[PDB]
Amino acid sequence: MFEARLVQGSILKKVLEALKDLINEACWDISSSGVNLQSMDSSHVSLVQLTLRSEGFDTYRCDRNLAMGVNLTSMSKILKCAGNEDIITLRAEDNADTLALVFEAPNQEKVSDYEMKLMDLDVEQLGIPEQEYSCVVKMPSGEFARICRDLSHIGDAVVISCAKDGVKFSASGELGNGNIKLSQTSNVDKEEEAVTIEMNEPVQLTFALRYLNFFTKATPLSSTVTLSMSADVPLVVEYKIADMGHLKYYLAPKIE
Amino acid sequence: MFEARLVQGSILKKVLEALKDLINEACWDISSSGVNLQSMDSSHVSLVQLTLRSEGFDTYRCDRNLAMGVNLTSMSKILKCAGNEDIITLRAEDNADTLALVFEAPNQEKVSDYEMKLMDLDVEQLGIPEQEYSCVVKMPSGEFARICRDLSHIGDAVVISCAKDGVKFSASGELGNGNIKLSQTSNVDKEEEAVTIEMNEPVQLTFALRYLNFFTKATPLSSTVTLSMSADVPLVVEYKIADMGHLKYYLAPKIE
Amino acid sequence: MFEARLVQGSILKKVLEALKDLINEACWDISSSGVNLQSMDSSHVSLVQLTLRSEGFDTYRCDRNLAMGVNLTSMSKILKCAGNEDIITLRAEDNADTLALVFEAPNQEKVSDYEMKLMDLDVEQLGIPEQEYSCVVKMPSGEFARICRDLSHIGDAVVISCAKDGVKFSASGELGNGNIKLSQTSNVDKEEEAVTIEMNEPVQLTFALRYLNFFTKATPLSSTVTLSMSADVPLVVEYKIADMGHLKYYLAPKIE
Amino acid sequence: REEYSATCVVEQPGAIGGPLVLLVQRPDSGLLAGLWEFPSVTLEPSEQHQHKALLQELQRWCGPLPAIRLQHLGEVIHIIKLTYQVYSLALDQAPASTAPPGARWLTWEEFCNAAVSTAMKKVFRMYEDHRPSLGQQVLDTFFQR
Amino acid sequence: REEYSATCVVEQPGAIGGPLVLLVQRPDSGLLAGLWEFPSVTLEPSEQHQHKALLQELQRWCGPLPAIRLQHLGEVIHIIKLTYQVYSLALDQAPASTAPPGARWLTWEEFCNAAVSTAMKKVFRMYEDHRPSLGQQVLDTFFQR
Amino acid sequence: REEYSATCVVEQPGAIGGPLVLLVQRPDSGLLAGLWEFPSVTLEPSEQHQHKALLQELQRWCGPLPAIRLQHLGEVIHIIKLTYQVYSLALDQAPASTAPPGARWLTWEEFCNAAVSTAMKKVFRMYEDHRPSLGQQVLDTFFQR
């Protein structure tokens, strides 16, 4: 018997919006720790890793570890029926082949309950070796979205440069090339609309803007984003979910 | 000689917006009482009934009962040229095969006058037996629109349940099913954002969400909507036009 | 060596937005006076004339008259990467076959520099005989846009009438016809949301609404627009760029 | 209002649980819209026995086929006035290339639990002789003239 | 600027008020855009008498037709430099299936009150010999080089 | 995961700098997406020598062609398990009508400086015998199972 009550249902709506376009079907790992989801896209070029700690729920209960295969498209259609201010509740009984979703309007006038048919497929398990990244970049989420959107008009690949000074975004195409240089904000501070660089070794990596434009669909989750890189190592785009967990995207770089 | 002056021209814009997508051509009954319009869609599954009492006009004049066949698509294109704050005036002379529409900007700087070519087709007259409905449901117009929109992602048919407690909206499809239960608001009150149930016999009817999604295009007319049902009786979705009349939609239910 | 620094970069974004859809490629005349651009569309029916005086730039420098052929589509894609509050800088060295564009974010945290590959084509030079127009019409830019948009639903041609009283916009089509009469605002005044007519001889000209709907894409440049006409003389739609220059559209009328 | 139509049940051998049958999808607008049915074609009652319209429609849903098995069955009277002539076609192999978007080759059990019109329900009955499901209503029943 | 073209007036017997004629619609952009005219095809002056481009265009607007009536008429000089060779084709029956989207078979009175180019106005004049309407202008007339 | 494919290098005489070759564009999604390569067709290893799928694909990119020159070359092993059989076709003239949207007839120098897959790089090597460019990687190399 698994039941999880989340007061801020907008979190769950945004999460499916951040996966629907990149992953069509994924497996949900439910346990005492919380919710975990790991899946690569069809091309095996990118991977998403969702973690929702149980402590971030109003109510949490899990009598048995569950492995739920879920059509993310179907689940987003259902979550579309939920209001941003609704209290969402996920429920999965022991001998039930379906997932129950209960949306509760704020003023208790309206109560919705859904039931998606659910599926199961043989999926492979991987691991992410938690290593030391040569350069960690923390920057506003909106700004990173604008950059990845803008350079998509110049070219289809982006070269991220790392140094102690700042981070550089470059792209080239038929019409020309462009360089977006973000300086290490040291005199601004104020809100977390700042840019901080923690650089060890200079990093120079190239990535596909198509996949990055799928990652920035997680922008509504967090005001900021962190990018982690190393020498010939997949990129880590991390979106923090408010004191509940995170949503990390992994993306493979290229070499000749 | 027919002339009708309406200060709030937005009413007429919204009305054509609420008919264009459902009815392509309809006949307009003009008389001393006001304006009346009755027409079914091509499939004969739904029907619209528009009533605009003459008392709701700034100026009204009708020397002869007129039966005007009007391409609603053409009339909406013309009404698109009117501003929400314009004073609209309809005029139809005796020996004129066209309808005159005069839009007057508020500050009198701009005056527009149009003339649609008008048509005529043989249409059949029906009647609506004003009967007693087993359950009348009054609810916010926006909420009813959200419900009909949301369940369209689950399935293509909706089952409306009636009881003394409340009203239930259910739908089923390939991904699963959902139930939207609206409680009888007795402790909320405040504005007309409340839900009131006047139930005699329990009603259970199934309808097509496609047609209902055409009805909710009349949402800007009224803050609330009323739904009337009976045992194996067409549905009455009524939209109140402010102290001028109403816009009623009729929709046939199904049985085996 | 040509360098031009413009604090209000929104001006340049709006200008390319006002040319992209009408002209695909054009030649840029750079000199000590400023920037000039003249080009007809493919059908030779309309012409655009852009003038940006050098005095309207924060910094201006031009050591050699330059004739730059520019793909306007490519330049708008690049200008899309600029924020409305960015300081745009155009730079063109002597022996450089590319145009440099530097976008500077307001708080100096972000600095972008682009480089479009640039092209060259043999284009013909024309001249506009600065003559006396029989009727000059000054009116709000938004209103002129609404008129040209609305009459596009009635017909594809518009007849502009001139007189001492006011200006009339008429169009006819399959559904009917319409007349938009704008009165000479003499009791309104207030802001430049007024309409002034300077009429000598009555003018009656017909134009294609398609091309006029390309001209109104320059609406964000100015709050007002001026229309100049004469007897069998191209139309002059003039958009004033704030103390920097203007953007004039020319459009040929018809006769049998 | 008299409306004349003509349908055909294209039958394929298939594998287990055969034989398989073709079924197209009705448009998303109109009377009895959205349901699946056998390929049909509307025509005037002056041409109530023409094979060209049917064979042309079958080519749009199956491609070319050797016209050497088009067999007549009977008459399906659907209660407008719908008059539908029921035909039958059997193929020795699979369709030309594949089922175009909109077609589904269901089995006998897959067809006895899907969704079709009450008119087509009487169409599958004549095919076997010679060998809670609701339907949208019409407002004409409640609003007389 | 020299531009070579070639048009043809496809004529059908029709019924009352005949004969009927085919007419395609010009694109919504360019010089004299939006008006209706007979099917035409642009080509280089090095190939100013080729029937392939015309017959191929006619098939796109009528389908296959027995090439047994393509008759030459004369030369239409339109004042770029437009040179158009005028042909003529007459059919004994109706088009192959129907008029594709963009075609209209108008009568003699239906054509004498529609909207065509001044070049096509001279095209219908040569066809009858052997048997307030405004037009968009060009800014080249006001802005000399 | 074993994946069987088969490609062909359609060669045209052309003019200067010949011979010319055809090249289609890969889809914008998947592994090595967006790059140009010779026309290829995926198939099961049970049908690893069929010409129908290749010749049908060539018709979609060139139209009909006299099947009188389809010559086998060798085997291209691409490191899933991609097995691609390399063929060759030479035409005596130009394509049927023109290159459909998505095709580009580049020269030898125009092809030695464009963008192709490392698998196709070995395909052009076998054709010449008998006569900084980066590529997207896969997360399987960093996340073992």
mmCIF file of all heavy atoms in Angstrom, chain C residues 125-154:
data_model
loop_
_atom_site.group_PDB
_atom_site.id
_atom_site.type_symbol
_atom_site.label_atom_id
_atom_site.label_comp_id
_atom_site.label_asym_id
_atom_site.label_seq_id
_atom_site.Cartn_x
_atom_site.Cartn_y
_atom_site.Cartn_z
ATOM 1 N N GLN C 125 20.102 51.076 -58.160
ATOM 2 C CA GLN C 125 19.803 52.268 -57.380
ATOM 3 C C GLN C 125 18.669 53.051 -58.026
ATOM 4 O O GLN C 125 18.608 53.181 -59.253
ATOM 5 C CB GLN C 125 21.040 53.160 -57.247
ATOM 6 C CG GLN C 125 21.965 52.790 -56.098
ATOM 7 C CD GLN C 125 21.441 53.246 -54.746
ATOM 8 O OE1 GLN C 125 20.335 53.779 -54.639
ATOM 9 N NE2 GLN C 125 22.241 53.044 -53.706
ATOM 10 N N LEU C 126 17.779 53.576 -57.192
ATOM 11 C CA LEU C 126 16.638 54.364 -57.636
ATOM 12 C C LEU C 126 16.656 55.725 -56.940
ATOM 13 O O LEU C 126 17.603 56.074 -56.229
ATOM 14 C CB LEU C 126 15.328 53.618 -57.371
ATOM 15 C CG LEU C 126 15.038 52.362 -58.198
ATOM 16 C CD1 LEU C 126 15.409 52.581 -59.659
ATOM 17 C CD2 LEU C 126 15.734 51.128 -57.628
ATOM 18 N N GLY C 127 15.598 56.493 -57.155
ATOM 19 C CA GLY C 127 15.454 57.786 -56.510
ATOM 20 C C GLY C 127 13.997 58.079 -56.240
ATOM 21 O O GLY C 127 13.111 57.659 -56.992
ATOM 22 N N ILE C 128 13.747 58.807 -55.156
ATOM 23 C CA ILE C 128 12.385 59.176 -54.778
ATOM 24 C C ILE C 128 12.209 60.679 -54.956
ATOM 25 O O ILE C 128 12.670 61.457 -54.107
ATOM 26 C CB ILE C 128 12.069 58.762 -53.334
ATOM 27 C CG1 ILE C 128 12.561 57.337 -53.061
ATOM 28 C CG2 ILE C 128 10.579 58.893 -53.068
ATOM 29 C CD1 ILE C 128 11.950 56.286 -53.956
ATOM 30 N N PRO C 129 11.552 61.133 -56.030
ATOM 31 C CA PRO C 129 11.374 62.578 -56.234
ATOM 32 C C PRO C 129 10.555 63.216 -55.123
ATOM 33 O O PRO C 129 9.334 63.040 -55.069
ATOM 34 C CB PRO C 129 10.644 62.661 -57.582
ATOM 35 C CG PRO C 129 10.835 61.323 -58.223
ATOM 36 C CD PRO C 129 10.934 60.341 -57.106
ATOM 37 N N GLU C 130 11.217 63.954 -54.232
ATOM 38 C CA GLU C 130 10.537 64.586 -53.108
ATOM 39 C C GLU C 130 9.548 65.632 -53.609
ATOM 40 O O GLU C 130 9.934 66.767 -53.911
ATOM 41 C CB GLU C 130 11.555 65.212 -52.150
ATOM 42 C CG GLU C 130 11.021 65.500 -50.750
ATOM 43 C CD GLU C 130 10.834 64.242 -49.910
ATOM 44 O OE1 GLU C 130 11.210 63.142 -50.371
ATOM 45 O OE2 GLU C 130 10.312 64.357 -48.779
ATOM 46 N N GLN C 131 8.275 65.259 -53.702
ATOM 47 C CA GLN C 131 7.238 66.094 -54.290
ATOM 48 C C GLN C 131 6.249 66.555 -53.223
ATOM 49 O O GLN C 131 6.358 66.216 -52.041
ATOM 50 C CB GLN C 131 6.511 65.340 -55.407
ATOM 51 C CG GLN C 131 5.788 64.088 -54.931
ATOM 52 C CD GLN C 131 5.008 63.403 -56.036
ATOM 53 O OE1 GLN C 131 4.275 64.046 -56.788
ATOM 54 N NE2 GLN C 131 5.167 62.090 -56.144
ATOM 55 N N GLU C 132 5.268 67.337 -53.666
ATOM 56 C CA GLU C 132 4.211 67.845 -52.801
ATOM 57 C C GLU C 132 3.034 66.879 -52.844
ATOM 58 O O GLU C 132 2.502 66.592 -53.922
ATOM 59 C CB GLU C 132 3.778 69.241 -53.248
ATOM 60 C CG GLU C 132 3.062 70.050 -52.181
ATOM 61 C CD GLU C 132 4.019 70.633 -51.159
ATOM 62 O OE1 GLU C 132 5.238 70.655 -51.429
ATOM 63 O OE2 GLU C 132 3.552 71.069 -50.086
ATOM 64 N N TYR C 133 2.627 66.381 -51.681
ATOM 65 C CA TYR C 133 1.516 65.445 -51.607
ATOM 66 C C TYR C 133 0.207 66.190 -51.385
ATOM 67 O O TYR C 133 0.143 67.147 -50.607
ATOM 68 C CB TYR C 133 1.748 64.416 -50.500
ATOM 69 C CG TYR C 133 2.946 63.534 -50.774
ATOM 70 C CD1 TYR C 133 4.149 63.737 -50.113
ATOM 71 C CD2 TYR C 133 2.878 62.507 -51.707
ATOM 72 C CE1 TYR C 133 5.248 62.938 -50.369
ATOM 73 C CE2 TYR C 133 3.973 61.702 -51.968
ATOM 74 C CZ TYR C 133 5.154 61.923 -51.296
ATOM 75 O OH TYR C 133 6.248 61.129 -51.552
ATOM 76 N N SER C 134 -0.837 65.745 -52.090
ATOM 77 C CA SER C 134 -2.118 66.440 -52.053
ATOM 78 C C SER C 134 -2.781 66.343 -50.685
ATOM 79 O O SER C 134 -3.474 67.279 -50.268
ATOM 80 C CB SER C 134 -3.046 65.880 -53.130
ATOM 81 O OG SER C 134 -2.474 65.999 -54.420
ATOM 82 N N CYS C 135 -2.588 65.231 -49.978
ATOM 83 C CA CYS C 135 -3.225 65.033 -48.681
ATOM 84 C C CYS C 135 -2.297 64.224 -47.792
ATOM 85 O O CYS C 135 -1.917 63.103 -48.144
ATOM 86 C CB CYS C 135 -4.576 64.327 -48.833
ATOM 87 S SG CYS C 135 -5.477 64.088 -47.280
ATOM 88 N N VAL C 136 -1.936 64.791 -46.644
ATOM 89 C CA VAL C 136 -1.120 64.116 -45.642
ATOM 90 C C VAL C 136 -2.017 63.764 -44.465
ATOM 91 O O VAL C 136 -2.763 64.618 -43.970
ATOM 92 C CB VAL C 136 0.062 64.991 -45.193
ATOM 93 C CG1 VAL C 136 0.802 64.327 -44.045
ATOM 94 C CG2 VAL C 136 0.997 65.249 -46.362
ATOM 95 N N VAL C 137 -1.945 62.513 -44.020
ATOM 96 C CA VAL C 137 -2.801 62.003 -42.956
ATOM 97 C C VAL C 137 -1.916 61.496 -41.828
ATOM 98 O O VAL C 137 -1.091 60.600 -42.037
ATOM 99 C CB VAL C 137 -3.730 60.888 -43.458
ATOM 100 C CG1 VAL C 137 -4.600 60.390 -42.325
ATOM 101 C CG2 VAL C 137 -4.577 61.382 -44.619
ATOM 102 N N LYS C 138 -2.096 62.059 -40.636
ATOM 103 C CA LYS C 138 -1.394 61.632 -39.432
ATOM 104 C C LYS C 138 -2.396 61.005 -38.473
ATOM 105 O O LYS C 138 -3.403 61.633 -38.128
ATOM 106 C CB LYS C 138 -0.683 62.813 -38.771
ATOM 107 C CG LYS C 138 -0.156 62.529 -37.377
ATOM 108 C CD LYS C 138 0.451 63.785 -36.768
ATOM 109 C CE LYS C 138 0.859 63.559 -35.322
ATOM 110 N NZ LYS C 138 -0.312 63.262 -34.449
ATOM 111 N N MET C 139 -2.120 59.777 -38.043
ATOM 112 C CA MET C 139 -3.076 58.991 -37.276
ATOM 113 C C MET C 139 -2.315 58.010 -36.398
ATOM 114 O O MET C 139 -1.147 57.705 -36.670
ATOM 115 C CB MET C 139 -4.040 58.235 -38.198
ATOM 116 C CG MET C 139 -3.353 57.226 -39.087
ATOM 117 S SD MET C 139 -4.524 56.114 -39.871
ATOM 118 C CE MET C 139 -5.476 57.266 -40.849
ATOM 119 N N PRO C 140 -2.946 57.498 -35.338
ATOM 120 C CA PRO C 140 -2.271 56.516 -34.481
ATOM 121 C C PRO C 140 -1.836 55.285 -35.260
ATOM 122 O O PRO C 140 -2.546 54.802 -36.144
ATOM 123 C CB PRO C 140 -3.337 56.171 -33.435
ATOM 124 C CG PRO C 140 -4.177 57.400 -33.352
ATOM 125 C CD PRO C 140 -4.224 57.948 -34.755
ATOM 126 N N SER C 141 -0.650 54.777 -34.918
ATOM 127 C CA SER C 141 -0.114 53.612 -35.615
ATOM 128 C C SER C 141 -0.943 52.366 -35.335
ATOM 129 O O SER C 141 -1.188 51.560 -36.240
ATOM 130 C CB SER C 141 1.341 53.387 -35.209
ATOM 131 O OG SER C 141 1.459 53.306 -33.800
ATOM 132 N N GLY C 142 -1.370 52.179 -34.085
ATOM 133 C CA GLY C 142 -2.180 51.016 -33.766
ATOM 134 C C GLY C 142 -3.492 51.008 -34.523
ATOM 135 O O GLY C 142 -3.915 49.970 -35.044
ATOM 136 N N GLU C 143 -4.140 52.172 -34.615
ATOM 137 C CA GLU C 143 -5.408 52.267 -35.329
ATOM 138 C C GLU C 143 -5.245 51.912 -36.803
ATOM 139 O O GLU C 143 -6.062 51.171 -37.364
ATOM 140 C CB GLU C 143 -5.987 53.670 -35.177
ATOM 141 C CG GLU C 143 -7.431 53.771 -35.609
ATOM 142 C CD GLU C 143 -8.312 52.765 -34.898
ATOM 143 O OE1 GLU C 143 -8.241 52.684 -33.652
ATOM 144 O OE2 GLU C 143 -9.063 52.045 -35.586
ATOM 145 N N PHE C 144 -4.196 52.429 -37.448
ATOM 146 C CA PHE C 144 -3.957 52.084 -38.845
ATOM 147 C C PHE C 144 -3.724 50.589 -39.009
ATOM 148 O O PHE C 144 -4.165 49.989 -39.997
ATOM 149 C CB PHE C 144 -2.771 52.876 -39.390
ATOM 150 C CG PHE C 144 -2.415 52.529 -40.806
ATOM 151 C CD1 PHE C 144 -3.196 52.976 -41.859
ATOM 152 C CD2 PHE C 144 -1.302 51.754 -41.084
ATOM 153 C CE1 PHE C 144 -2.872 52.657 -43.164
ATOM 154 C CE2 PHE C 144 -0.972 51.430 -42.385
ATOM 155 C CZ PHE C 144 -1.756 51.886 -43.427
ATOM 156 N N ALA C 145 -3.043 49.967 -38.044
ATOM 157 C CA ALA C 145 -2.849 48.521 -38.102
ATOM 158 C C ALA C 145 -4.178 47.784 -37.988
ATOM 159 O O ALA C 145 -4.442 46.843 -38.745
ATOM 160 C CB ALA C 145 -1.890 48.077 -36.999
ATOM 161 N N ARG C 146 -5.032 48.202 -37.052
ATOM 162 C CA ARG C 146 -6.329 47.553 -36.888
ATOM 163 C C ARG C 146 -7.164 47.668 -38.159
ATOM 164 O O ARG C 146 -7.777 46.687 -38.601
ATOM 165 C CB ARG C 146 -7.060 48.164 -35.694
ATOM 166 C CG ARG C 146 -8.445 47.601 -35.433
ATOM 167 C CD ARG C 146 -8.378 46.153 -34.992
ATOM 168 N NE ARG C 146 -9.129 45.919 -33.762
ATOM 169 C CZ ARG C 146 -10.435 45.675 -33.715
ATOM 170 N NH1 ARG C 146 -11.147 45.639 -34.834
ATOM 171 N NH2 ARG C 146 -11.032 45.471 -32.548
ATOM 172 N N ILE C 147 -7.180 48.856 -38.770
ATOM 173 C CA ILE C 147 -7.936 49.062 -40.004
ATOM 174 C C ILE C 147 -7.463 48.105 -41.092
ATOM 175 O O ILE C 147 -8.261 47.362 -41.677
ATOM 176 C CB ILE C 147 -7.824 50.529 -40.457
ATOM 177 C CG1 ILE C 147 -8.552 51.445 -39.471
ATOM 178 C CG2 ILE C 147 -8.365 50.704 -41.869
ATOM 179 C CD1 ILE C 147 -8.446 52.908 -39.813
ATOM 180 N N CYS C 148 -6.155 48.107 -41.377
ATOM 181 C CA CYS C 148 -5.627 47.255 -42.441
ATOM 182 C C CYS C 148 -5.844 45.779 -42.141
ATOM 183 O O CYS C 148 -6.028 44.977 -43.063
ATOM 184 C CB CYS C 148 -4.141 47.537 -42.649
ATOM 185 S SG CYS C 148 -3.786 49.240 -43.091
ATOM 186 N N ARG C 149 -5.821 45.401 -40.863
ATOM 187 C CA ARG C 149 -6.102 44.018 -40.500
ATOM 188 C C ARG C 149 -7.573 43.685 -40.721
ATOM 189 O O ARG C 149 -7.902 42.647 -41.309
ATOM 190 C CB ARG C 149 -5.711 43.781 -39.043
ATOM 191 C CG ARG C 149 -5.560 42.327 -38.654
ATOM 192 C CD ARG C 149 -5.407 42.194 -37.142
ATOM 193 N NE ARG C 149 -6.633 42.558 -36.436
ATOM 194 C CZ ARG C 149 -6.757 42.577 -35.113
ATOM 195 N NH1 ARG C 149 -5.726 42.255 -34.344
ATOM 196 N NH2 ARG C 149 -7.913 42.917 -34.559
ATOM 197 N N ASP C 150 -8.468 44.567 -40.276
ATOM 198 C CA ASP C 150 -9.895 44.273 -40.329
ATOM 199 C C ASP C 150 -10.396 44.180 -41.765
ATOM 200 O O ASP C 150 -11.116 43.241 -42.121
ATOM 201 C CB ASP C 150 -10.664 45.331 -39.544
ATOM 202 C CG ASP C 150 -10.437 45.212 -38.053
ATOM 203 O OD1 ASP C 150 -9.831 44.204 -37.633
ATOM 204 O OD2 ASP C 150 -10.853 46.120 -37.302
ATOM 205 N N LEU C 151 -10.019 45.139 -42.612
ATOM 206 C CA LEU C 151 -10.504 45.127 -43.985
ATOM 207 C C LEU C 151 -9.950 43.959 -44.789
ATOM 208 O O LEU C 151 -10.498 43.643 -45.850
ATOM 209 C CB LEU C 151 -10.166 46.447 -44.678
ATOM 210 C CG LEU C 151 -10.825 47.687 -44.073
ATOM 211 C CD1 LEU C 151 -10.341 48.946 -44.766
ATOM 212 C CD2 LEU C 151 -12.348 47.579 -44.150
ATOM 213 N N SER C 152 -8.881 43.314 -44.313
ATOM 214 C CA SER C 152 -8.372 42.125 -44.988
ATOM 215 C C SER C 152 -9.356 40.967 -44.928
ATOM 216 O O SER C 152 -9.262 40.045 -45.746
ATOM 217 C CB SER C 152 -7.038 41.698 -44.378
ATOM 218 O OG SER C 152 -6.058 42.705 -44.552
ATOM 219 N N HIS C 153 -10.292 40.989 -43.975
ATOM 220 C CA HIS C 153 -11.340 39.980 -43.919
ATOM 221 C C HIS C 153 -12.483 40.280 -44.875
ATOM 222 O O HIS C 153 -13.236 39.366 -45.229
ATOM 223 C CB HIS C 153 -11.884 39.863 -42.494
ATOM 224 C CG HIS C 153 -10.837 39.545 -41.473
ATOM 225 N ND1 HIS C 153 -9.639 38.945 -41.797
ATOM 226 C CD2 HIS C 153 -10.806 39.749 -40.135
ATOM 227 C CE1 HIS C 153 -8.916 38.791 -40.703
ATOM 228 N NE2 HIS C 153 -9.601 39.270 -39.680
ATOM 229 N N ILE C 154 -12.629 41.533 -45.295
ATOM 230 C CA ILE C 154 -13.700 41.920 -46.206
ATOM 231 C C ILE C 154 -13.282 41.736 -47.654
ATOM 232 O O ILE C 154 -13.990 41.099 -48.440
ATOM 233 C CB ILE C 154 -14.124 43.376 -45.926
ATOM 234 C CG1 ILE C 154 -14.524 43.539 -44.460
ATOM 235 C CG2 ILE C 154 -15.256 43.790 -46.849
ATOM 236 C CD1 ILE C 154 -15.621 42.604 -44.023
#
